[PDB]
Scaffold this active site. Sequence first.
Site: not given
Lengths: 260, 260, 260, 260
Positions: D137, D150
């Site tokens: 990401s 995350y």
Amino acid sequence: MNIDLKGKVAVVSGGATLIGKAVVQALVSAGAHVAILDIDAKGKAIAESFNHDVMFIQTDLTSDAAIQQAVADIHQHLGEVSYLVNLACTYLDDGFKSSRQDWLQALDINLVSTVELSRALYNDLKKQQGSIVNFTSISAKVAQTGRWLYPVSKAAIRQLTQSMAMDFAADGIRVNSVSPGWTWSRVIAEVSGNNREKADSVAADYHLLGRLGHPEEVANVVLFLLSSAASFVTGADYAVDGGYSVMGPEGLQPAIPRLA
Amino acid sequence: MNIDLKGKVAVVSGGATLIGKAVVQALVSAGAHVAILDIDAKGKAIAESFNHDVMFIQTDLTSDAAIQQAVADIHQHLGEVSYLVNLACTYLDDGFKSSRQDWLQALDINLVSTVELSRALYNDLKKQQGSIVNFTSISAKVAQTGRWLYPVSKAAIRQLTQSMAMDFAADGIRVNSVSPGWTWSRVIAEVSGNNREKADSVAADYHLLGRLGHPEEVANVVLFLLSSAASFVTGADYAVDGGYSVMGPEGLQPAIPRLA
Amino acid sequence: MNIDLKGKVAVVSGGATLIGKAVVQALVSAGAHVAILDIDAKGKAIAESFNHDVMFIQTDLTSDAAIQQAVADIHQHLGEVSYLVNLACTYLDDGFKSSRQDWLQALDINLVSTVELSRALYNDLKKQQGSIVNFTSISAKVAQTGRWLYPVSKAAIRQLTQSMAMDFAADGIRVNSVSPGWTWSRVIAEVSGNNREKADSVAADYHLLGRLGHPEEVANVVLFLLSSAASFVTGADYAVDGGYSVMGPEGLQPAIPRLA
Amino acid sequence: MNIDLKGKVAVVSGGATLIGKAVVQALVSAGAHVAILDIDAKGKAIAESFNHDVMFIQTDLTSDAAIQQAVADIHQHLGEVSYLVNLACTYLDDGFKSSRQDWLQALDINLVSTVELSRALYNDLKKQQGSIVNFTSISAKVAQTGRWLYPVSKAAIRQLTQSMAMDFAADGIRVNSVSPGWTWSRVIAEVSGNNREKADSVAADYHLLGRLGHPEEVANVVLFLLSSAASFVTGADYAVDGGYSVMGPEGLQPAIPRLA
């Protein structure tokens, strides 16, 4: 890889190299017309290979007048430009021994001329909402003994790609960079004796995939980034190096056992 | 930060800036003799505050003759050089509007001149087995609207620092880079109205520590890398940016709630 | 490197390693009291080496109760903590052959326990406005054949260092990471036959400085980042790898000539 | 983007998300048979839209038995697997507030389960000499206030992608990662009131292209990496973030003028 770029016009600096020709062939196959800008005379034979689909314009990109004349010729024969691939470079590089004059010459060719060619084509790319692909290398991310000018130039191209992406986004232009590893070359083909299987085995030590990359494999990444499939990709560096850049000085061979 | 560099000689290009002045004081406090090289005349006043330990030599580092003369003066007054801090730079930068001539001028000052100054001092650093500190920026790792020449120049310095480290290691010379963020500067002091808490309030949005960096805080990192405490540090980039480079466009404020 | 940390209290996870002991000695020399938390029993001999300046507390950092008891013991004998060095790790790593159970065990030890130890000490670091140093590696930036758990763990520590830095800045706590290369080890000392000159020559292929790093050289960077000289350094990764991370699979030897 | 993958079988973990659905459609359009693995029941409706070409298998990838059963079902209905897209993730994330149990749960789902699913399918990918695409990401390259699990998980995926590439290359398997930015999602659609132009207006501050990414735009990059056009791409991270990752805390707006 069956992209459709029918009617679009592309410009490929440094199109006389094996990578350059593969990028030109990839664009023609997609239906685009290509203008090859290069100082090398072998580009004329490449352009004639595609007949009226490709045009060759011998251009010294360090000369502002040569760039203006090339864009005038592109407009006369082909039309408005949608894609620019900045692949022109010089391998003038002797590390610490290279002089100030060599430094500025290499930077002018490798870096500053990319800005001027983009500037000369900007209004086209703005109207066409096109995309630009610059060329970095694995040498922009790592140091190589005896090579200063080209690695530093390519590291500078990487940052230029980001700054262009930011300041070109408002006009709908995407700008990215492609980072290849050792790719089968004209120079490698001559020093190897046009022996590919031996050159691949030498390159296996530095590429996880165990060979030199093919120019076509590099061209695929260029076309993807130019195409509308990469419509949310801007300012990125897309590595096509067969795993070169994931490794360090230990390579892909065990290093701990040597300690025993 | 009580390092002993008694008798060692250091050279600080671009020493007239606030960063330069802090680096000069840090070196003198550590017992070193310092030669200030700069095109700005404000360096003369800085050297005079330290009497015979610091020297000022007005130098246009784009002139090879000026560099040779500067090294000759260092040899006469101070002696063999052990430390080189490459802090000279230009802020000539108009983004896309900058011309080809502006590009080469900025690259000559920011990048190529670092090579020539290093080359003129190499035999000293080799005999003394010294260390070199170049200056990158937060601008070498990120894109900033309207700024091309300085970010690209600093991105090139980062790679040059790595290639210098590799090709200088055999001679026992360490080469590293320092990457500061927004640091209190003369230019900020003038736009700020010499209001530091007001300038700190703007910079808090871009630095986790909520202010501009002090020139001394940058100098501390420079001094560490020059010292023998960093004896296993070469080719590295040491960030002193108060957390600038860990953030992206979201800053340090939550962004998801804005979607509701 | 004569830093003054008189009266301060430091905590060093994994202090039984050679790096750990060097970090402990560096802190004691600066006047600080140190608590060594480790599962290895040899830490007791290290703590006794400094008499009342260092204390040893055998702690399984995967046990929340063990951490609470260790902080209670630190408070009883030493006091409020100012510095935390997270050096604890496991070398449980068999690459693809490592199982899910091994993965979670290694991640719990290498990564999750760093959060819990920081959480147990947070109110101390907040009141003292202290600093934290985590440990990454050259393995967090590169791939090494047959090693998955430790490189991935260290790459995760690198990101954790950034997120801690951002969310701890409001409380005046600085958080950084240290990235060493091959450092002289207990394991290397035994497989080499306590032969340093041979182990250095093996390591020369992967470090520009031509040897393994000394634990003391790593400790210097830890102390700098903990000290107030690094007062504008937060969220940064400080490499102390002798140039390992500037190189790729070609190492520091020429690669083009092999093609001929 | 008209790739031919006729007869090839692909597996897409976390296929119930908008990204997953776009990747499934891209693969089916390319002629591939797809197995959707997810804990969300909304995947069942996605598979039924493609009739016999797409299959749904509700799978808790933290259960080794569930993975073995999922591979058994793929073998019965579709056959040997050529492509694996690891898109399964959890957003269990409370930053510093997340507990040790939450950490290990998030790591098990986001990271360790990727290894077990790859291990169960390895003999297929080896025989078919396929490719793997993991998901990083923009959060793996930067810190975001209040989000630890995350971002750290994705930073770990990035390194795992590199180590997988190295140790899988000998078997002819390519492994890469895709790094998207803010992409239109189910969660954004609910906080947005299913207002896309309003959500685009917020995201313009963090993406050079001035909007959220489309799931299809991410799927295009996934499909390229799976295809044979990316035959020299392994171990790379391909960003599809609309320019997010080239920016820092200053965003795409000028910041220096704020100091005046």
